[PDB]
Amino acid sequence: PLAKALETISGIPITPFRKSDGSIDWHHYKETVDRIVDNGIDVIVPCGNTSEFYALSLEEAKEEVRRTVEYVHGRALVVAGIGYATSTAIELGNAAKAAGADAVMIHMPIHPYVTAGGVYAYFRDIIEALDFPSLVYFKDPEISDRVLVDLAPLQNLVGVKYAINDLPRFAKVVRSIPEEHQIAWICGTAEKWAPFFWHAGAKGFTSGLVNLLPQKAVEMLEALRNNDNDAVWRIWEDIVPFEDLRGKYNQGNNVVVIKEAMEMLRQNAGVTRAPVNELSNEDKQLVTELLSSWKL
Amino acid sequence: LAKALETISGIPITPFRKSDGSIDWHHYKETVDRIVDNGIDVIVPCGNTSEFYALSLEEAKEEVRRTVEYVHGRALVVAGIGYATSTAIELGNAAKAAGADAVMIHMPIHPYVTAGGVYAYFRDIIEALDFPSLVYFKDPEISDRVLVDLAPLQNLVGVKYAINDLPRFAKVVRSIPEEHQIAWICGTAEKWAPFFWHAGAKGFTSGLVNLLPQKAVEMLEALRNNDNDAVWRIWEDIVPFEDLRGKYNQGNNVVVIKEAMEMLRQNAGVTRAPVNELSNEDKQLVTELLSSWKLLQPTK
Known part of the structure; x- marks a missing residue:
């Protein structure tokens, strides 16, 4: 049953855009797709909001x-x-x-x-x-x-x-x-909300984090499936600051935070397309602090 | 051109057939005519209305x-x-x-x-x-x-x-x-036009023109003439209609206009999903509103 197959992590890939002319870089998109599916994610959603x-x-x-x-x-x-x-x-x-x-x-x-x-x-x-x-x-x-x-x-x-x-x-x-x-x-609101939804009946969750660190999302899924509450909260506390940052400005930071974080990790993401431009120096520092926190 | 835009910008509905949801261009022409032939000098196709x-x-x-x-x-x-x-x-x-x-x-x-x-x-x-x-x-x-x-x-x-x-x-x-x-x-029509006007606006959008363009024109003229008593009178007269359109976080915005037009024997058809027809409760509210405006034909 397809429904059962969908009770897992649904990875939503970014669409890499060149800073030069805003065009899509398909080579970078391939790298993103590979990072997601080669690291434990069995469902990918092109044309998703991320x-x-x-x-x-x-x-x-x-x-x-x-x-x-x-x-x-x-x-x-x-x-x-x-x-x-x-x-x-x-x-x-x-x-x-x-x-x-x-x-x-x-x-x-x-x-x-x-x-x-x-x-x-x-x-x-x-x-x-x-x-x-x-x-x-x-x-x-x-x-x-x-x-x-x-x-x-x-x-x-x-x-x-x-x-x-x-x-x-x-x-x-x-x-x-x-x-x-x-x-x-x-x-549908990712890792920050997944633990709560899971307890209430959800058997899967979407994720934009898989674009840079699919391992963390997989750890969350396995902990939830194993009913390992201690592990669940540990991974949750580890991930939530990233999701909080993405949620700034009524979610305006949702994708740009992912792309600038990826670029700081030397992964290819490019920039977001208007109506969303680059992060402020302030948010850039917060991203840096998060990656540093994750020891990346 | 900026000066020409300081007036009423009428936003026409797009008549859709109840049978298959297709656009009835004949009805659209009727709507365009009702708008522009009654004092509206700016029309905005592909507007949200x-x-x-x-x-x-x-x-x-x-x-x-x-x-x-x-x-x-x-x-x-x-x-x-x-x-x-x-x-x-x-x-x-x-x-x-x-x-x-x-x-x-x-x-x-x-x-x-x-x-x-x-x-x-x-x-x-x-x-x-x-x-x-x-x-x-x-x-x-x-x-x-x-x-x-x-x-x-x-x-x-x-x-x-x-x-x-x-x-x-x-x-x-x-x-x-x-x-x-x-x-x-x-951009929020007649309910807000008087307040925006006092603050600096020199024009306003209107969905009301689809059925009663003269009411919109009356508000514009009153505002331009600084006839405060007239402005508030016209405003109080139109507000209930705008509030009814605003129900359900604006979900009623166009459907109220279309069902009101149909009651006045004006061709509008229906809205397309994601908006369906009015509930019996709301249909009654539209009726009572048109009745208060003294627009419904006498019955007996």
């Missing part, structure tokens, strides 16, 4: 998925992020299907106006039109969890990346959906 | 083309554009070729944004297009310094300020020299 999906043209988005399937060459499941207007999401999905992806992850709609009934229809229509394994990234607190309960029966909804950091809500929705729907519950 | 993000890139381009055709000189056409910088530039160049007068760059929808990056985002698009541009500024987490730094751009002709923070708005208006000539537009 990939700066929205900074990519549709052609670039399709090519990233295409290149991912090629570079991965069976070493991991490939989940293609898709989004935008219904017809566009379907176009991206079909391109991903032909490219050889294993499933698609439907980003949450970015429209300024959304309602529960409309969000349900949005996801449902794309999943039914594609007739292909799909995951949904659920992150708007203003939209009722009932949407997930109603989508659960869909054959092709194999998982949900729950991204609302409301533990009571998550615990409740996990228990409001029959086991016969086989939904893989994944913490 | 137009459900821009629910349109494919090709549908967005076609809407701009259709607008230029249906308007045929009766008003300035400002094309909404957005997405990745290259994509925004593609949409912008398409609008230019279609005959648009300017473009409105939507606030980027990327989940991760920083002040320096947003500045670069807008700057890169404006410089690449070398065409009159407006920016929709609505994220309170992004410093107004971004606007101060963009102001010098020759092609930045206006800002649709959409952060309902009056002290912030009043200060940024006074932080940019007259030398940069910027049309300051209240």
Whole structure:
């Protein structure tokens, strides 16, 4: 069951951009893909938010998925992020299907106006039109969890990346959906939140940290699976400062912190694309202090 | 051009068929006509009221083309554009070729944004297009310094300020020299227009024009004439409608307009997912609102 295979770490790769002209450096992307899949990560998500999906043209988005399937060459499941207007999401999905992806992850709609009934229809229509394994990234607190309960029966909804950091809500929705729907519950907010989500029912989590230190994410996963609380909290305390730094400025630092940290480690990442520019000298020092703390 | 933008910027809906969600261009033409034939001199296809993000890139381009055709000189056409910088530039160049007068760059929808990056985002698009541009500024987490730094751009002709923070708005208006000539537009419509006007705005956006353009015109004229009693009277009259549209964190923004238009026998069709039809409760609230405006036909 694909759902079971998704109950692990979903690594979200960065999309390296050249500082010179902002173009994608595919050689660097290959190095990123290798670092992730060659180090214990069995699920990779091109066109995810950590990939700066929205900074990519549709052609670039399709090519990233295409290149991912090629570079991965069976070493991991490939989940293609898709989004935008219904017809566009379907176009991206079909391109991903032909490219050889294993499933698609439907980003949450970015429209300024959304309602529960409309969000349900949005996801449902794309999943039914594609007739292909799909995951949904659920992150708007203003939209009722009932949407997930109603989508659960869909054959092709194999998982949900729950991204609302409301533990009571998550615990409740996990228990409001029959086991016969086989939904893989994944913490969509990474390592800082994974321990808490895990206790509440999650069996997997996303990670941007795998772009530089996949070993740390794997350690977290194994500790959680082994029910080794002591180890879990140890690795958590070790990782959370990095996640806190990424979360600065209402998450504005989310990808740029990863890229500047990678570059300080001499890994190739390049820069972020506008609407996000480089870190301030202040944050650069904080990144340095973190890597120093990790003895890297 | 900046001066011409100091007025009402009408944002047309994009009529969608209930049957298959396709765009009904005949209904779109009717909407464009209702807007421009009733005092509105600036129309903004691909605006958020137009459900821009629910349109494919090709549908967005076609809407701009259709607008230029249906308007045929009766008003300035400002094309909404957005997405990745290259994509925004593609949409912008398409609008230019279609005959648009300017473009409105939507606030980027990327989940991760920083002040320096947003500045670069807008700057890169404006410089690449070398065409009159407006920016929709609505994220309170992004410093107004971004606007101060963009102001010098020759092609930045206006800002649709959409952060309902009056002290912030009043200060940024006074932080940019007259030398940069910027049309300051209240991007949050009639409910906020009177307050923004007092603080320095000389224009405002409106979704209300899709059904009752005369009400929007009345507010603009009252504000321009400094007729305070009239401003507040018109304001109190329109607020309930804007509050109903604002329900569910703005989820009701367009659907309320469309169901209200249909009740008034104006062709609007429905909204596209991620927004579906109104609940019975809200349908009743729209009815009671139209009834209070004395717009519903007598029954018996």
